[PDB]
């Protein structure tokens, strides 16, 4: 055939891939974390948006830290050979490097490590997208008028 | 004939800059997710993903500013934070 370029990810596998949405709205009272009013609007918008991009969307609601880790582990052990990519959306409280389960924190590195090139071989070489709606600390941006 | 880094081919689309709060509207959803979904709907058949996310950065930065009765929290702004370890361009369409 003619000249070939390899500058873009192959996105014409039989499936676009999974889109896992973790929607944490209500937190255990003992944590003191506030309920995240509006997050259901986000979760519905994401489900529809990624549906129209032909992702297999799985919505999860109000997961403990243990459930988040087990979910990510199990998903990373699926056979993604026929999938072009992987998407995970995290909607929760957070601080720098951390997202909250309903009962306590999860290191973001623990979640993403399951999908490392050596640990999820059926996603090696494929784009792994993590979309994170969560705080990263407590600083406020005062802005500047233009 | 070679290895790739185990950290290659990840993209982290953070709603806010390191160290910062992220803003969520109780009626409309979060500023970032509102904007991300709007830009994907408009541009996923047209633009490479980093350029989509740059439009999201612009929309969040330009179009949102919070209102609060608390002077500490009033009139603040947000910039999302695109963290790319990707090694290729990403288009959601093909062929």
């Amino acid at each position: 055939s003619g000249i070939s370029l390899d500058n873009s990810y192959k996105m014409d596998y039989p499936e676009m891939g999974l889109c896992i949405i973790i929607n944490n709205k209500n937190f255990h009272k003992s944590t003191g974390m506030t309920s995240r009013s509006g997050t259901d609007v986000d979760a519905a918008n994401l489900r529809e948006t990624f549906r129209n991009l032909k992702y297999e969307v799985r919505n999860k609601n109000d997961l403990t830290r243990e459930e988040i880790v087990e979910l990510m582990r199990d998903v990373s052990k699926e056979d993604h050979s026929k999938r072009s990519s992987f998407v995970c959306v995290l909607l929760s409280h957070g601080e720098e490097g951390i997202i909250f389960g309903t009962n306590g924190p999860v290191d973001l590195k623990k979640i993403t490590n399951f999908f490392r090139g050596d640990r999820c071989r059926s996603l090696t070489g494929k784009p792994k997208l993590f979309i994170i709606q969560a705080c990263r600390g407590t600083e406020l941006d005062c802005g500047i008028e233009t | 004939c070679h290895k790739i880094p185990v950290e290659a081919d990840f993209l982290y689309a953070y709603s806010t800059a390191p160290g910062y709060y992220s803003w969520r509207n109780s009626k409309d959803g979060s500023w970032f997710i509102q904007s991300l979904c709007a830009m994907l709907k408009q541009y996923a058949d047209k633009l490479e993903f980093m350029h989509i996310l740059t439009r999201v950065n612009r929309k969040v930065a330009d179009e949102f500013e919070d209102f609060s009765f608390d002077a500490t929290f009033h009139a603040k702004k947000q910039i999302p934070c695109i963290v790319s370890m990707l090694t290729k361009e990403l288009y959601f369409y093909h062929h």
Partner: peptide, 4 residues
């Protein structure tokens, strides 16, 4: 408007 709320913070996360």
């Amino acid at each position: 408007d709320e913070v996360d």
